Design a binder for these strands. Structure first.
Lengths: 114, 79, 206, 96, 150, 127, 98
RNA sequence: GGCCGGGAACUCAAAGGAGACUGCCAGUGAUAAACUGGAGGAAGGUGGGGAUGACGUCAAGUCAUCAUGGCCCUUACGACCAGGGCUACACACGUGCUACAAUGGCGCAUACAAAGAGAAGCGACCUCGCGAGAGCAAGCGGACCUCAUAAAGUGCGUCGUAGUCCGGAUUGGAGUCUGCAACUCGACUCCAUGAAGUCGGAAUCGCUAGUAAUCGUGGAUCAGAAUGCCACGGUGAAUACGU
């Protein structure tokens, strides 16, 4: 059924659909399927079990959907949720990249808060 | 983290990495160099970062390897 | 400010120049800087010469700068000293074995700088601004310059009033491209602020 | 004003030759990946107030940094009077 | 105002040799896209023949008579007071507004592509629907009923 | 013989050569369907070519570089008209009546600073 | 092949520059094919007037500096023997360039 | 490949010109002026654009560009140097850009420009980097070397509107170069990131032919760090009856 976690694809181009995976992404979808040796414009409904077996092994060497977002998470508080400037921007939700922290960076902090 | 090769530190402490590290550690260092990274071989050593008034301290570990100082030292008194 | 300088916008006509020469990128800038060193230290030191213009030509490593002056006998110096000593000045202040040249200005009434020098020379003379102003106007008219509108900068009188002097005389067709108007101004550092003068001699056509 | 400021870099470039023009290139081969000895890089640190990145692009009449031009490097403000009076050859008001 | 300008002279259709069809692609141009419109509207018009199933050189108007406008609001604030005053259509707008009545609902209809989405609405007028049709349904209401102020 | 016309339309510059017969059109050493083959502007140049007779009597060994889709075509659609003038000096009326004689001098704006596209005023709605 | 440059500015100088050399740099030996243009090169300026909130001005200033192509491909002595007998047209070089 | 010769016919190019000037047929119209219909010629009534802002005009702004009266202090409201900050946020606004896709995306084949810049430079080429760029490097003093290939575009399968392969924030990881050193306050690349937003109300503004609309291209400013700004091209409509 489900290979390794979230974002199960259906009826979409193999690379285009594998972008829905969060383990792989915009271009890890094509890079990992390059190691899969399958067609690309074919739908996920066109996929069979004989090719997805070569995915559980290569998602083990790669970052899995469920984990990827967790080891990135506490690694922040592992090293950089101290008095670190960026961590000051994580516990508060502000950008770390040094741009204008008032507005035009709305998505980083959240919705408008008048 | 902006070099990835040939990591260099300013002599606000590099003058003393050969002179103060040899003495173990002293009172927090009169350090105006928040710019460099801390190498992992300064465990626990007190580098007092000049936030602008004077030099403020930071707590140091060894999972600390290639991270910067000024990061660990806030500059602005928010609110 | 809507009064562009008429000479440069008419420079595409016989309007003369004061630094015309050639260079590649490796030596425009220093040569331009060398041109200012000779451009500035030949004016402050040369207040009494009544210089109309100093023109820079740079043929090859030994330049032929010419100087437009009013009185031929006064610019000689003490009989050739300024010819040599200022060439000594330029030999290093410009970095080339330069050759100086001096050009006369016939009828200095015909030069907008030199007349503006003349009024400015007598502005600090502690005189009143109207009578002396109009007196010089016809002097050129008796000697030509078929049209000049005369302007004096602000700060007239002991009061905050800083006004202009429009005072048109003759034909000065500024918007007409075929006008070849002779324009240069002059200013005087007064004991109260800045007092200047602007004059537009009309030297016929072509 | 600020002639001292306008002369500040005049003495923060007078040392560049003896420090960068004749020594930094010797350490520059280490600086670029040509072997990155950390210890050997300390040598360039001897000068501080000189640097290739420390050019102030100082206009040589009024000392404003802003308004440079790599061909000459003068402010846009003083070239104007240089324009009509002819001090810069080959220039006339650009009517195209 | 007092002066007038003549209508800009237009070369005919580069494919059918008919100036009226050439003018049609010129109104849909947003983002400067006729070459895309070549794969959008020219690909649409090529399909308009067989989908209609007849020669779209003069049968092209068999769906346009109802679209004929008669009046539109002209803002005459005569003497400083805005009035209804609908002036009857003059030829330089009654045909321009005909093209202005076409793609108002044909950008993001949620279909394959507007390479052929526009190729859905055209036969609808000679199949009695589409955007150009109901345009004339609202014009009749604003005029012909307010004689006390029309 | 070979029949010469400079031609230029909207900063486009070709060199158009007509020879009697030899209908095939050589454009930058490329075929009609190769270089100007079925694009947005591939019959927009030959409207002046149905009023006159068909392909079989004229050759176009064309020296064309520079221009866009309609630009490289613009240097041709005007380049052909100047290079067929010496072909026949009497048919000038028909193309002038059709307007193809007159050069399309609709030169694009040489931009002026300030306004965004040199004649379009930016968005500062409140005054 | 040797290609010559004629570094001048204006019609008042480039006009005689391209003809006084063709008459003198091709007497008998050189293969000067007449005055070849080498079209001029132009650079433009973006100049502001008074330093203030007003970025409005942005004046324009252009430089039309031209070059010619006398192009003495033949290293003939007499063609360059008379090169030193004239001194007008101050800033111009006979660049013997490939 | 037009490669060398070679023609410079000739694209292109440039030192000079001419060509549109109410010039003419005809008419409206006092005949006049003006206007109009028509003709000629590439160019019909300033052909097309810029340069050029009268008198005046506002204590306009500018002593923070400079100069500049008066007011200051001169071991100093002078200065050197080192950190930071001009980008910090609790929000509002001004401007621009990016989208919100299938007029688009993917990759494949395809032809598609101009202007410029530069021997302290682009950097040819050659190897790898998914790339950043790096190791090698011609050439040129630039109608001779690079940037730099155009790009949308078309045909090919493609999803048929999917908060979407849209979009790109975003984050941290991995790295490239710039500069000693770049968290604050370098860029760039790769990876994950796929958010809001699926065309925006009250409303409001811009718009006259190559116009809008666009598509990109570079340049200057540049140790470096454009959605800013300069410059160039690619495609290309309607509106303008009316006071």
């Amino acid at each position: 059924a489900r290979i390794a976690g979230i974002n199960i694809p259906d009826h979409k181009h193999a690379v285009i659909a594998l972008t829905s995976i969060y383990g792989v992404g915009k271009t890890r979808s094509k890079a990992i399927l390059a190691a899969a040796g399958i067609a690309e414009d074919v739908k996920i409904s066109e996929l069979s079990e004989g090719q997805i077996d070569t995915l559980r092994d290569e998602v083990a060497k790669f970052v899995v959907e469920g984990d990827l977002r967790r080891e990135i998470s506490m690694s922040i508080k592992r090293l950089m949720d101290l008095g670190c400037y960026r961590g000051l921007r994580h516990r508060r939700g502000l950008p770390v990249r040094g741009q204008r922290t008032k507005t035009n960076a709305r998505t980083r902090k959240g919705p408008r808060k008048p | 983290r902006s070099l990835k090769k040939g990591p260099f530190i300013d002599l606000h402490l590099l003058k003393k990495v050969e002179k103060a590290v040899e003495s173990g550690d002293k009172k927090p260092l009169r350090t105006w160099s928040r710019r460099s990274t801390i190498f992992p071989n300064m465990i626990g050593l007190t580098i007092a970062v000049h936030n602008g008034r004077q030099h403020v301290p930071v707590f140091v570990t060894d999972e600390m390897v290639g991270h910067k100082l000024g990061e660990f030292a806030p500059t602005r008194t928010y609110r | 400010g809507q009064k562009v300088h008429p000479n440069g916008i008419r420079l595409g006509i016989v309007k003369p120049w004061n630094s015309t020469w050639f260079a590649n990128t490796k030596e425009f800038a220093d040569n331009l800087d060398s041109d200012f060193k000779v451009r500035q230290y030949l004016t402050k030191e040369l207040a009494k010469a009544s210089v109309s213009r100093i023109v820079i030509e740079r043929p090859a490593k030994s330049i032929r700068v010419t100087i437009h002056t009013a009185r031929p006998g006064i610019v000689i110096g003490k009989k050739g000293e300024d010819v040599e000593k200022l060439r000594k000045v330029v030999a290093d202040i410009a970095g080339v074995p330069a050759q100086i040249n001096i050009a006369e200005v016939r009828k200095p009434e015909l030069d907008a700088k030199l007349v503006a020098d003349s009024i400015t020379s007598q502005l600090e003379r502690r005189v009143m601004f109207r009578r002396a102003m109009k007196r010089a106007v016809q002097n050129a008219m008796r000697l030509g310059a078929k049209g000049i509108k005369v302007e004096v900068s602000g700060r007239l009188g002991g009061a905050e009033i800083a006004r202009t002097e429009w005072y048109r005389e003759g034909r000065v067709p500024l918007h007409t491209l075929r006008a070849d108007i002779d324009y240069n101004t002059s200013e005087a550092h007064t004991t109260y602020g800045v007092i200047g003068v602007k004059v537009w001699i009309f030297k016929g056509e072509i | 004003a600020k002639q001292s400021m306008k002369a500040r870099e005049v003495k923060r470039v007078a040392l560049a030759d003896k420090y960068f023009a004749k020594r930094a290139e010797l350490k520059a081969i280490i600086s670029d990946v040509n072997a990155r000895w950390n210890a050997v890089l300390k040598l360039q640190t001897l000068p501080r107030d000189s640097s290739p990145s420390r050019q102030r692009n100082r206009c040589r009449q009024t000392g404003r940094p802003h308004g440079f031009l790599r061909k000459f490097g003068l402010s846009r403000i003083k070239v104007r009077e240089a324009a009509m009076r002819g001090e810069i050859p080959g220039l006339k008001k650009a009517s195209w | 105002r007092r002066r007038v300008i003549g209508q800009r002279k237009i070369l005919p259709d580069p494919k059918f040799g008919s100036e009226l069809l050439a003018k049609f692609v010129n109104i849909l141009m947003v983002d400067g896209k006729k070459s895309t419109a070549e794969s959008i509207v020219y690909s649409a018009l090529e399909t308009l023949a067989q989908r209609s199933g007849k020669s779209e050189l003069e049968a092209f108007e068999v769906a346009l008579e109802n679209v004929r406008p008669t009046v539109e609001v002209k803002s005459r604030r005569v003497g400083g007071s805005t009035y209804q005053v609908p002036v009857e259509v003059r030829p330089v707008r009654r045909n321009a507004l005909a093209m202005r009545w076409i793609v108002e609902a044909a950008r993001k209809r949620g279909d394959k592509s507007m390479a052929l989405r526009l190729a859905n609405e055209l036969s609808d007028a000679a199949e009695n629907k589409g955007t150009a049709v109901k345009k004339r349904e609202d014009v009749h209401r604003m005029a012909e009923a307010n004689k006390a102020f029309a | 013989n070979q029949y010469y016309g400079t031609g230029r339309r909207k900063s486009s510059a070709a060199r158009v050569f007509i020879k009697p017969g030899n209908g095939k059109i050589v454009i930058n050493q490329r075929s009609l369907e190769q270089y100007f083959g079925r694009e947005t502007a591939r019959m927009v140049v030959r409207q002046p070519l149905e009023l006159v007779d068909m392909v079989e009597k004229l050759d176009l060994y064309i020296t064309v570089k520079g221009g866009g889709i309609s630009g490289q075509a613009g240097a041709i659609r005007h380049g052909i008209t100047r290079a067929l003038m010496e072909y026949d000096e009497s048919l000038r009326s028909e193309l002038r009546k059709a307007g193809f004689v007159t050069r399309d001098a609709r030169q694009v704006e040489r931009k002026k600073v300030g306004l965004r596209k040199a004649r379009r005023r930016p968005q500062f709605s409140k005054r | 092949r040797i290609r010559i440059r004629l570094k001048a500015f204006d019609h008042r100088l480039i006009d005689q520059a391209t003809a006084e050399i063709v008459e003198t740099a091709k007497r008998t030996g050189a293969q000067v094919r007449g005055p070849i243009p080498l079209p001029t090169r132009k650079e433009r300026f973006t100049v502001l007037i008074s330093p203030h909130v007003n970025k409005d001005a942005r004046d324009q200033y252009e430089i039309r500096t031209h070059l010619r192509l006398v192009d003495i491909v033949e290293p003939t002595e007499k063609t360059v023997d008379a090169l030193m007998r004239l001194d007008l047209a101050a800033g111009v070089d006979v660049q013997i360039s490939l």
